[PDB]
Structure 1
Amino acid sequence: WTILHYSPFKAVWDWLILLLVIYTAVFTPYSAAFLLKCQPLAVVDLIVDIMFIVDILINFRTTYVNEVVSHPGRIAVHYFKGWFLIDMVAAIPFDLLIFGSEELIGLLKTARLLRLVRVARKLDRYSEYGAAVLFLLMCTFALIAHWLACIWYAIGNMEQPHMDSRIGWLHNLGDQIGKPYNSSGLGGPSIKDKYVTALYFTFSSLTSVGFGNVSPNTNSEKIFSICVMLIGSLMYASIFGNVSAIIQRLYSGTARYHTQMLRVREFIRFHQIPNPLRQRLEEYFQHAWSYTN
């Protein structure tokens, strides 16, 4: 048995694995930042790990181009000469292999972020349709915002229990919603209050608006904000440059239409064309356009 890389199954499988990479890009950074000390998420997370292992076996049973190559020896060698290393490191369950506290074991599952490479390889499939690349550009923006929300909470939570004298962003969140910390550094805002504030501040930093209630005070928070002003000015110019270019690509029929309509309209004015002829020129352009695009 072997799967053809252009078959309708392999198309549906690559679009299914895109959604499981988006699940990984959301819930791995979130669990590593907010949750370090069956449940519905624990069974879903195991299902997703099993499907990323099935995808390794499919990559030993799929054709490739040099026209098609269809022999299991030449297929398995092509995978071992390239991506099989990264696809295996993205799948080794170190949680079942290491014991050294459970903080390290829970953090080590960040190795799953190598699954983003399965989206970097397959841009030949995903970038073919203009409506699908708008979804990838908005998910790239919302995932850059989410990963920065996890780094920003890690930076805050590694300074909140310090000899901080109540200066870092989490102590100010405690005051601002009426949920102050105890003198022990314990209690205070919930995980929803802290995550929603960390995502709000990083969309605020990336889209360059500051409403004044969350702001960086410590040197680590200021250095993070300088880095997010550099990331924001590159990535927002590149992403919304590409979103504008793809919107201009989708609008390009109407953009060419109004341009050629203005040529015909201005030619009619310049020659002062009589009405019985004028209607025939304008109706002809509407016919020749709606026939040929």
Structure 2
Amino acid sequence: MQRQFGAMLQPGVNKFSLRMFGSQKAVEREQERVKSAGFWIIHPYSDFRFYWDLTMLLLMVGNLIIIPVGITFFKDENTTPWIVFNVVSDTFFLIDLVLNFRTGIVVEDNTEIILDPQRIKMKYLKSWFMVDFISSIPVDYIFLIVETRIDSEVYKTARALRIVRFTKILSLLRLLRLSRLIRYIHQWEEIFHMTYDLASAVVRIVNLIGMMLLLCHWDGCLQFLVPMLQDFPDDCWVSINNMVNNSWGKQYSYALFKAMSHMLCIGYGRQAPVGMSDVWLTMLSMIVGATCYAMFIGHATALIQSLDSSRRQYQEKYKQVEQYMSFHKLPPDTRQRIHDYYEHRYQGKMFDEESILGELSEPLREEIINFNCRKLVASMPLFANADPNFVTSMLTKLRFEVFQPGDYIIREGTIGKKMYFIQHGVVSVLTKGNKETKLADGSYFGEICLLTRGRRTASVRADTYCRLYSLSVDNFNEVLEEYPMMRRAFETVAL
């Protein structure tokens, strides 16, 4: 299958490519730009790069956990499965270092992914080649093989002891795979922000919890490593606690306890540090742990301030309204009225209807307005015998309004300028002759002033917290400007 390998390196059409490049035609143009690049160029949004980086993350986490425990706590680090594990890992990392010479580079300074095979080489050499080249090759086995090639009988004096100490130091160059771990996790978390829309504070605090666990683990390995390379002098914390000859589990547990004690701000180990190794290592672990815990408090605060943002914005708005009422020295009755109005208008959380209906497109706006109000405008017989385009063009002019119980919605004797549709609540129509009718949901009132443009003949008082839709006369005239046939029909039926 010489075509399937060429297909997997190219960025396939998925949710991510359609969201990045915009159209399917742009993704096909990107596939053609990968095709015209050269000999087997890997695009960093493909499927092969994804599954390869997934296997590399599942290998790097295991390497960064297993390798310091294998180096520091065990004495003979030349057993057969340990060498097998290191050689298999370094084989995968050399394969990844070769494949980095064929992967495109996503630059955040443009929308142009670099696919020039010479320019990716001249960028990867100038950016991240030295770290990956150190962390890929087994420098310790190179030093061991070269030292035994120089002297096959090197174990005569205590110089071979220094060779073993320097082997254990050079084998910590495999901890520079953290750079590739960080660069792969950021590169795929940006993609998963683009696709799935997860909260940014959750992602950053998961990243920080991962780094805190990894640094606590490395510091716990380090505070046993440095007394181990000094052959456990009588002032290190290992020999003071008489735990030189315990099992490696107890050594790792108590060392990780020292690291976590100086990380989460508790302290100490058994006693205070004594030797000059332990004092400076404890100060290093204290600096690293206090920095990581301060950043954890920062990410937790940024997470908590995004949980109730709408209700927080509501309370900021209502404190501004409290200041407005205090500035003009309003009586407390009106303050109770305004408080009840904001409790029954926004229901404790802030939203701006005008900006939200402005940001939406046209069919979503029409769909929301239809679902809200077409069941109400169908109940009026002036509108059921008209153009559906007239109704659709008229529904945009409705305004949502809220009235408290006791309010005069329509005061009798004024110029009628608005027509009201009832969504929720019960109103009372007072007319002359001491007649008081009740209107409820799905009803309407104030329609004579729309047609005739006269004055008010009856009062309307709200009895509950009424949610109403309003239609002005001027907006109705603007709707009649485009539809003159229904205007002439209203002129004839008005006769």
Q: What TM-score, normalized to structure 1?
A: 0.75
- The 5-angstrom pairing of residues 33-112 of structure 1 reads 33-37=72-76, 42-64=83-105, 65=107, 67-97=112-142, 98-99=144-145, 100=147, 101=160, 103=164, 104-112=166-174
Higher strand share: 2
Larger Rg: 2
**How far does residue 194 in structure 1 lie from its aligned partner after superposition?**
0.8
Give the Å deviation of 1:54: 2.0
> What is the rounded CA distance, in whole Å, between the counterparts of 1:151 and 1:284 in structure 2?
53
SS at match of 2:273: coil
Q: What's the offset of the Cα at 1:33? A: 1.6
1:184 corresponding residue in structure 2? none
Task: Please give the alpha-carbon distance, in whole angstroms, between the structure 1 residues aligned to 2:257 and 2:41.
Answer: 47
Cα offset, 1:226, TM superposition: 2.8
CA contact (8 A) 2:72 2:228 kept: no
Structure in which a larger fraction of residues adopt helix: 1
Q: Are 1:169 and 2:223 counterparts?
A: no
Residue 221 of structure 1 deviates from its aligned partner by: 1.7
Q: Mark the CA change 1:209 to 1:61 in structure 2 (over 3 Å): closer, same or farther.
A: same
Residues 40 and 243 of structure 1: CA distance in aligned 2, closer, same or farther (over 3 Å): farther
Corresponding pairs, count: 273
- The match for 1:125 is 187
Structure 2 distance, partners of 1:214, 1:19, is 38
Q: Tell me which of 247, 250, 273 is aligned to 2:303.
A: 247
| Letter in structure 1 aligned against 2:137 | I
- AA in 1 matched with 2:346: E
Q: How does 1:256-275 map to 2 (within 5 A)?
A: 256-263=309-316, 267=321, 271-273=335-337
Q: Determine if contact 2:135/2:176 at 8 Å carries over to the other structure.
A: yes
Change (3 A) 1:7 1:214: farther
Identity of aligned residues (%): 25
Deviation at 1:225, TM superposition (A): 2.0
Identify unmatched segments of 5+ residues in structure 2.
Answer: 1-39, 148-159, 194-199, 323-331, 357-495
Partner of 2:176: 114
For structure 1, which segment, 60-69 or 140-149, has the greater mean C-alpha deviation from structure 2 after superposition? Answer: 60-69
**Aligned-residue CA RMSD in angstroms?**
3.5
Q: How does 1:182-197 map to 2 (within 5 A)?
A: 188-197=245-254
Using the TM superposition, name which of 266-275 and 112-121 deviates more.
266-275
* Distance of 1:272 and 1:30 partners within structure 2: 67
Contact 1:94 1:108 in 2 (8 A): yes
SS of residue paired to 2:217: helix
Q: Is the 8 A contact 1:160 1:171 kept in 2?
A: no
Deviations 1:188-232 (A, max 9, x none): 311111110000011101222136635423232223223333333
- The question of 1:138 aligning with 2:209 is answered yes
Q: Does 1:226 align with 2:283?
A: yes
Partners of 1:192 and 1:214 in 2: CA distance: 21
Where 1:281 maps in the other structure, the secondary structure is: coil
Structure-2-length-normalised TM-score: 0.47
- Cα distance change, pair 115–211 in 1 and its aligned pair in 2 (3 A): closer
2:43–2:49: 8 Å Cα contact kept in structure 1?
yes
CA distance in 2, matches of 1:114, 1:143: 13
Q: Which has the higher contact order (CA 8 A, sep 6+)?
A: 1
| Structure-2 separation of matches of 1:14 and 1:245 | 32
Tell which deviates more after alignment, 54-63 or 149-158.
Answer: 149-158
Query: Residues 201 and 62 (structure 1 numbering): CA distance in 2 closer, same or farther, change over 3 Å?
Result: same
- Cα-to-partner distance string for 1:216-250 (whole Å, 9 max, x where unaligned): 2323222322333333333432x3244225424xx
